[PDB]
Design a protein around this ligand. Structure first.
Ligand SMILES: *[C@@H]1O[C@H](CO[C@@H]2O[C@@H](C)[C@@H](O)[C@@H](O)[C@@H]2O)[C@@H](O[C@@H]2O[C@H](CO)[C@@H](O)[C@H](O)[C@H]2NC(C)=O)[C@H](O)[C@H]1NC(C)=O
Ligand SMILES: *[C@@H]1O[C@H](CO[C@@H]2O[C@@H](C)[C@@H](O)[C@@H](O)[C@@H]2O)[C@@H](O[C@@H]2O[C@H](CO)[C@@H](O)[C@H](O)[C@H]2NC(C)=O)[C@H](O)[C@H]1NC(C)=O
Ligand SMILES: *[C@@H]1O[C@H](CO)[C@@H](O)[C@H](O)[C@H]1NC(C)=O
Lengths: 533, 537
């Protein structure tokens, strides 16, 4: 019997599994229960801590995926399926996973906690692309990822009611962070050196933990990839949440908050999923029904407000974007777009595309967007129009929110490092015109190119190893730079003035200025003043 | 007595003077009365045509300049004095000038009619830089210029009243234009080939004649230099006109606010002309050169709608138009009010002076609008670079007041039938006395169009003389044929028409013609397409 695979946590005993990598074995503990299953009466409720068990919990395989819509846009296509659930769906899904070196560290080891994206309507910790084994082996950290409830199960809110308070998915994440505080030491992890990182909605989640004081004492450093708590898609107000919760009820045959929630609890999970996407008239991936609610509790004010009022001395943040943040999203609602042709669009389509990428704003506001993003020497060139709408969508939802976060955190005391990820994966199944699409830096951070059963190049393995080092450096010291390394070019902190960031791809680090400063001035400075008066 | 200097017009007989030019002799008739003097009871009234006279009127020198404010910003400085009045001020000023070749043309000749600028508060046809002699000698055209009333005397309006109807300055111009149709044939000019041209307020004036049917009969082609009727400064609404007229009246003790129009105007008529001029600039709280009190009024008479509206609604087939701007339209204006500016230093302004400058140069807009302007003109990678800020404030003022109005006009005329030719004048004069940072300022293409470098007593370079001759050729070609291009010259670079799509224009300087696209297209999209929509909601 292998002693290294037996661990005792506060709730009881676990048996893990040894995993192989090209660099040696790694210990893994998969599908560890950290909450009581949020089913029946516990649906829509905050998570209850897992009650202690007797005997040995089998932790050798991934557990169920939280209930979510399954994307059927391009069935069988690698580019979409790689994000789809790869275990059966279940409300019994609150499990987390621990990877650790083999044999287990005997001195305290820095901990990385991963939070997946998926727009708050999907995601799972078991996707192949979030495989912890290569990071752990190469950089000898402990790595933890959790599942958290999404869609209505995670973020349906009837503000003020105890039957559906909202943000319980965020609370799932917090419970896992509490779990890591109490138990990571049993795996060799140092609970005083926890680094959060996430992508997209995961990045937004990280940011919200930064801004919610009960979470802030559960981790030390943060990494936000292609996402930010202050993006226009990541939060909803109390009044609008109540409307949305009520609309979902009517759509599924449900009629007093107590009576409403009780009825929702009688409906099968699949029923709620099937109506989730129909609660808003113009509902898309950038305007989903059930997202984090600003209700004074988890978030005392809006993330914009909390950021501006914050004192962020003592915080190191790693933030960044991919080269083409908007391109991926265009095939999910923008007219004229497909992965199977060049997606050259007409100006009429461009104007319509703008109302989709920037939903629920006045005609005046939409007019300003079209003004800024039209080349008036070439107002109707189809190739330029495709790039422009990609930029509109990318800048409004990802780049400029991240740029704002970086700027404000820096000016208010955080040490910030910014990057733009510019390498297109040799294995990328999306079309050439999409460039470096949203979410395709992840496989490199997790070192998936080291898996020889996949078809990355020798250059890409070296590239992946660089990135894992930057990330792990940051997790250990708060500085991505090779702690002592003279001649290799240095990654400078991002500041509100100089606005310096580095480009990540096969070439060495290149320092540049401005995360699309001209465009982000439009989105971050002017356009809000417009939407008011 | 010489027979070339004797001409009979409908009013009676005239005697002119023979002018020496470097390239030859020219006949000139300066100071022809085309209207009864707008004195006493006729102050603020439309011009009455000049009553016939017996005997011979000597048209041998420039007549008086219409009453106006005299710029004292930089006394003795040639850059400002060259625009100031160079005859005595008088309300008795409605005279025009004719230049014609020597000897008088035997077959009908193209007529260029010049309208001076000066923001509707100043100007005169007698300024040295408007001397018709070189254009006439070099290109064999008839050149005509008129005086027209300015400031309160031309444009004080109490709309609806008969005692101060408004736009009388424009009516002065129209009367001069009618005079040309009746009498220019007597000088060998062809009344069916008349080309209006003007600069700044002169260009705006030309544009308003385009949009006013009674005037539209009196000419055939148009040239608009650095100005347009849709500019934010060139017109005013009826109610605002009345408020301004009433305030001026109040500031001079009339009556001893508002009341009967007849009594109010009658009281105004008893004030000495100079008194009106001295109070004229204090009607508005923050008054400037791009916001003068008395300008043309939109009242349904001379202009049936706003110039913007009349343009869009217009059918301009059969019309040829030549339009343009100088390279740095906004710089000249910055030393007349903007914080941190002077002709005597580099005028490197701070971020705060820039924000303050925007409010001055784009007057009376909401804070939202002022914000929008600051956004578009800030380089957010270098938000506080004083040189860049200076350039940007110059661009703000220039784009708002000249370039984008001219661009809107060009595009809309081209789309709706007119053949349009467009230029950017990029040459800085060697004799220029304004500081080097102003680049090519507003109004400094005029001396080249009028061929002033050919005057030996001025110290231009030989290249500038060549250049002046090129421009005179273009303008005169446009006048003759409706196309500034060299008839039957093939190897010479061609000047293509301006259209809404291609947006092509040529650069004019010492080098040959370079064709370019877009008259500050990105900036003007902002000023012409978006910024009005924001003022509504
Ligand atoms: C590029 O493709 C889009 C998407 O259309 C789909 O994908 C194509 C490869 C082809 O298989 C089509 O038959 C598919 O429907 C085109 O946009 C569609 O245009 C059709 C035209 O009738 C319209 O009915 C659909 O609603 C459009 N779909 C979307 C999402 O807008 C687009 O026209 C193609 N570009 C071209 C042909 O230049
Ligand atoms: C650039 O000049 C302006 C104008 O000031 C005048 O002209 C100068 C060339 C010099 O002769 C000054 O002494 C003159 O007063 C300066 O702006 C003025 O500054 C003074 C004092 O600081 C102030 O009282 C005025 O109100 C200012 N006028 C305006 C229109 O803003 C400006 O500071 C100069 N810039 C320099 C010297 O860097
Ligand atoms: C103004 O007063 C005059 C002088 O008596 C008078 O004739 C005229 O009718 C008055 N105007 C109006 C509009 O009543």
């Amino acid at each position: 019997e292998d002693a290294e695979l037996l661990v005792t946590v506060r709730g009881g005993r676990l048996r893990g599994i040894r995993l192989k990598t090209p660099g040696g074995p790694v210990s893994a503990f998969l599908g560890i229960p950290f909450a009581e299953p949020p089913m029946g009466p516990r649906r829509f409720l905050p998570p209850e801590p897992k009650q202690p068990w007797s005997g040995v919990v089998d932790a050798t395989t991934f557990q169920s995926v939280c209930y979510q819509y399954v994307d059927t846009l391009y069935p069988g296509f690698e580019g979409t399926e790689m994000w789809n659930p790869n275990r059966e769906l279940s409300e019994d899904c609150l499990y987390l996973n621990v990877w650790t070196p083999y044999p287990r560290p005997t001195s305290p080891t820095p901990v990385l906690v991963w939070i997946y994206g998926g727009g708050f309507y999907s995601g799972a910790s078991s996707l192949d692309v979030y495989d912890g084994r290569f990071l752990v082996q190469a950089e000898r950290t402990v790595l933890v990822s959790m599942n958290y409830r999404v869609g209505a199960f995670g973020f349906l809110a009837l503000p003020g009611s105890r039957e559906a308070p909202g943000n319980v998915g965020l609370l799932d994440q917090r419970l896992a962070l509490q779990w890591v505080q109490e138990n990571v030491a049993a795996f060799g992890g140092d609970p005083t050196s926890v680094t959060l990182f996430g992508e997209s909605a995961g990045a937004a989640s990280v940011g919200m933990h930064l801004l919610s004081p009960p979470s802030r004492g559960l981790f030390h450093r943060a990494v936000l990839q292609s996402g930010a708590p202050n993006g226009p898609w990541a939060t909803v107000g109390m009044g609008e949440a109540r409307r949305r919760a009520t609309q979902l009820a009517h759509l599924v045959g449900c009629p007093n908050d107590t009576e409403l929630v009780a009825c929702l609890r009688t409906r099968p999970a699949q029923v709620l999923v099937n109506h989730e996407w129909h609660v808003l008239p113009q509902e898309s991936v950038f305007r989903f029904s059930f997202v984090p609610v600003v209700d004074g509790d988890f978030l005392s004010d809006t993330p914009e407000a909390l950021i501006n009022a914050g004192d962020f001395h003592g915080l190191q943040v790693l933030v960044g974007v991919v080269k083409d943040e908007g391109s991926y999203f265009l095939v999910y609602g923008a007219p004229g777009f497909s992965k199977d042709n060049e997606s050259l669009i007409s100006r009429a389509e461009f104007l319509a595309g703008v109302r989709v990428g920037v939903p629920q704003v006045s005609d005046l506001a939409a007019e300003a967007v079209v003004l800024h993003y039209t080349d008036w020497l070439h107002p109707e060139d189809p190739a330029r129009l495709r790039e422009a709408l990609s930029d509109v969508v990318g800048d409004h939802n990802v780049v400029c929110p991240v740029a704002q976060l970086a700027g404000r955190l820096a000016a208010q005391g955080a040490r910030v490092y910014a990057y733009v990820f510019e390498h297109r994966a040799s294995t990328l199944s999306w079309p050439l015109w999409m460039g470096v699409p949203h979410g395709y830096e992840i496989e490199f951070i997790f070192g998936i190119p080291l898996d020889p059963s996949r078809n990355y190049t020798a250059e890409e393995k070296i590239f992946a190893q660089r990135l894992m080092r930057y990330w792990a450096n940051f997790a250990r010291t708060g500085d991505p730079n090779e702690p002592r390394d003279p001649k290799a070019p240095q990654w400078p902190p991002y500041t509100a003035g100089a606005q310096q960031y580095v480009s990540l791809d096969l070439r060495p680090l290149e320092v540049r200025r401005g995360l699309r400063a001209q465009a982000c001035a439009f989105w971050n400075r002017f356009l809000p003043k417009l939407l008011s008066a």
